[PDB]
Design a protein around this ligand. Structure first.
Ligand SMILES: CC(C)CCC[C@@H](C)[C@H]1CC[C@H]2[C@@H]3CC=C4C[C@@H](O)CC[C@]4(C)[C@H]3CC[C@]12C
Ligand SMILES: CCCCCCCC/C=C\CCCCCCCC(=O)OC[C@H](O)CO
Ligand SMILES: CCCCCCCC/C=C\CCCCCCCC(=O)OC[C@H](O)CO
Ligand SMILES: CCCCCCCC/C=C\CCCCCCCC(=O)OC[C@H](O)CO
Ligand SMILES: CCCCCCCC/C=C\CCCCCCCC(=O)OC[C@H](O)CO
Ligand SMILES: CCCCCCCC/C=C\CCCCCCCC(=O)OC[C@H](O)CO
Ligand SMILES: CCCCCCCC/C=C\CCCCCCCC(=O)OC[C@H](O)CO
Ligand SMILES: CC(C)(C)NC[C@H](O)COc1nsnc1N1CCOCC1
Ligand SMILES: CCCCCCCC/C=C\CCCCCCCC(=O)O
Ligand SMILES: CCCCCCCC/C=C\CCCCCCCC(=O)O
Ligand SMILES: CCCCCCCC/C=C\CCCCCCCC(=O)O
Ligand SMILES: CCCCCCCC/C=C\CCCCCCCC(=O)O
Length: 443
């Protein structure tokens, strides 16, 4: 209990409280003030950040006071109430994460793909419902004293206003643990593993080419040096801006002035990728290699025709022969031994991998909408990494009470507590939240 331990642990607990509060009001302020961040996914994130803000203000400081003082100095009424809020916050967090997982599944399986089927009205209704049901399953078994144990060590701690050690009967510690944590966790891990499976299997040429070519609504110059716009649409071979601006207006049918809209860029991208497949079926050297290939490897060939041209890809006489004979790794080395690989290495390696593996693993989490699914997977993933050891030691204590000490029980609970401050830092992955944070912090 040395002076450097109590002050040392006192400082880190104080910093943990500050990092949780600051970080979460930052997230709540960002979604409430910036319209770009006003989505149904972010509505569940503000629900998650609220529980985290309640954690850092109402549970973590009183928990820190219980460790340093080695006793409870807030009475028996605030003891039960503090514990009830604590349980409510963890239940609401995992259930909102479960709701996000389900919402993301219904979105990816819908033709909208990355848009939720829920409106903002029903999303709010879903959010207050998790808090009403969580509030009922968290406050009622504690206020009614259904959680209470019948052994001497327990009953004496309830009577003492100095004690607030969570003593429970084996029935509450199993029922509340599976209903408030294990059931939403199992559903979340099973449902969110499917959203990752869907995102990868549903990858097509349109998403693949948006990864490789990108999207720039303004007229720019590519790696080759020629003028390009939208998703890899070459305008002219002429090194003249007005020459490229003239051929731009002729493609849309209006005075563009060099600026294009998403509707126009997508329309131009659709006819471009259609011209790429049209050229393959007309070219005598590319037509049989296309028929021999599979749906995913066909996209890799279309991609090559989109970038280099129909006659360009027909030059790989050896590589095309290898693709028909289905000698993927032997095709890869010849494709590596090219000017195309030297000029665009990050793009070529992905297309070459797609020919080898015959999967979308090279284009794994490359799309902006996929990064958003990865970020949400990290939010869910760290939560279970932080809470699972505490919830495992909780369902082990019921079978054998002497197997684990009280010192390791609080430590694993605090591993779950520090999670409440990680979520805001994980949102820095999104550029929308990054731009929001910088503006609110005035940097
Ligand atoms: C211990 C108890 C009293 C604290 C509970 C606090 C309640 C009132 C808070 C915590 C989380 C909150 C929700 C967080 C998310 C949203 C989405 C937002 O776009 C509209 C409001 C709404 C729906 C909030 C309403 C109020 C809410 C349910
Ligand atoms: C030390 C940690 C303790 C401080 C905790 C929270 C401060 C919150 C900081 C977030 C910045 C204030 C929000 C803001 O930027 O203000 C809105 C502004 O009017 C634009 O609309
Ligand atoms: C402490 C409790 C709550 C802090 C949450 C911060 C309140 C949310 C920020 C609201 C805000 O200031 O934004 C105004 C916006 O312009 C309106 O549309
Ligand atoms: C005490 C904590 C109270 C925190 C209350 C924060 C909930 C309100 C909020 O996040 O604002 C969303 C806004 O309504 C979107 O338009
Ligand atoms: C079990 C978890 C149930 C949680 C309910 C989630 C509801 C949801 O996400 O909505 C799906 C879809 O939009 C409905 O049309
Ligand atoms: C911090 C490490 C993140 C652990 C979460 C996890 O299990 O990884 C799944 C994630 O979606 C992989 O991108
Ligand atoms: C804790 C000490 C408070 C210092 C506040 C601070 O660091 O400023 C916030 C931000 O950098 C403002 O641009
Ligand atoms: C033990 C103490 C200090 C009250 N912390 C509670 C934990 O942070 C999490 O509590 C829970 N949230 S949802 N389900 C639970 N539990 C964990 C404890 O045993 C009963 C059910
Ligand atoms: C103890 C209470 C400490 C901090 C909670 C207050 C923080 C709320 C600031 C909101 C200001 C705003 O963004 O409009
Ligand atoms: C109980 C299992 C609930 C299944 C949720 C729907 C998502 C899915 O079909 O994979
Ligand atoms: C196993 C325990 C936790 C995994 C974290 C939750 C994220 C879903 C997993 C993704 C996947 O399996 O593809
Ligand atoms: C990083 C998280 C590590 C420590 C947070 C401090 C809480 C430690 C609780 C255990 C105290 C004890 O009983 O020894």
């Amino acid at each position: 209990r040395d002076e450097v331990w109590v002050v040392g642990m006192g400082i880190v607990m104080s910093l943990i409280v500050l990092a949780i509060v600051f970080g979460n009001v930052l997230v709540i302020t960002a979604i409430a003030k910036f319209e770009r961040l006003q989505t149904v996914t972010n509505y569940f994130i503000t629900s998650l950040a609220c529980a985290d803000l309640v954690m850092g203000l109402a549970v973590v400081p009183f928990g820190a006071a219980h460790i340093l003082m080695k006793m409870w100095t807030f009475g028996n009424f605030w003891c039960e109430f503090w514990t009830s809020i604590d349980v409510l916050c963890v239940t609401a967090s995992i259930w909102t994460l479960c709701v996000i997982a389900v919402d993301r599944y219904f979105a990816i399986t819908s033709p909208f793909k990355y848009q939720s089927l829920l409106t903002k009205n029903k999303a709010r209704v879903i959010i207050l419902m998790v808090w009403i049901v969580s509030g009922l399953t968290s406050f009622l078994p504690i206020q009614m004293h259904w959680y209470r144990a019948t052994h001497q060590e327990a009953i004496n701690c309830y009577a003492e206003e100095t004690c607030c050690d969570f003593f429970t009967n084996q029935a509450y510690a199993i029922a509340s643990s599976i209903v408030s944590f294990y059931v939403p966790l199992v559903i979340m891990v099973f449902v969110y593993s499917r959203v990752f499976q869907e995102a990868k299997r549903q990858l097509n040429i349109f998403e693949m080419l948006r990864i490789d070519e990108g999207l720039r609504l303004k007229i720019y110059k590519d790696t080759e040096g020629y003028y390009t716009i939208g998703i890899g649409h070459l305008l002219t071979k002429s090194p003249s801006l007005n020459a490229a601006k003239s051929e731009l207006d002729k493609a849309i049918g209006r005075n563009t002035n060099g600026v294009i809209t998403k509707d126009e860029a997508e329309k131009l991208f659709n006819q471009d990728v259609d011209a790429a497949v049209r050229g393959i079926l007309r070219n005598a050297k590319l037509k049989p290699v296309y028929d021999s290939l599979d749906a995913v490897r066909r996209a890799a060939l279309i991609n090559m025709v989109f970038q280099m041209g129909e006659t360009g890809v027909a030059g790989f006489t050896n590589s095309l022969r290898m693709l028909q004979q289905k000698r993927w790794d032997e095709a890869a080395v010849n494709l590596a031994k090219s000017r195309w690989y030297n000029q665009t290495p990050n793009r070529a390696k992905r297309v070459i991998t797609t020919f080898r593996t015959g999967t979308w693993d090279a284009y794994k989490f490359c799309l902006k909408e996929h990064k958003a699914l990865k970020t949400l997977g990290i939010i869910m993933g760290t939560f279970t990494l932080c809470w699972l050891p505490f919830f495992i030691v909780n369902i082990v204590h019921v079978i054998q009470d002497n197997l684990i000490r009280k010192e390791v029980y609080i430590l694993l609970n605090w591993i779950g507590y520090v999670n409440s401050g990680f979520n805001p830092l994980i949102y820095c992955r999104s550029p929308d939240f990054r731009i929001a944070f910088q503006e609110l912090l005035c940097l």
